[PDB]
């Protein structure tokens, strides 16, 4: 999400999408 789903996409999912996505 980039509209307003980004609010948690990079607050909770920050340690997921920025982690397990790369590795």
Swiss-Prot record:
Taxonomy, superkingdom: Eukaryota
Transmembrane segments: none
Protein name: Magainin-2
Organism of derivation: Xenopus laevis (African clawed frog)
Gene that encodes the chain: magainins
Full-sequence portion shown in this chain: 83 to 105 of 303
């Amino acid at each position: 999400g980039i509209g307003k789903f980004l609010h948690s996409a990079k607050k909770f999912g920050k340690a997921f999408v920025g982690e397990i996505m790369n590795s």
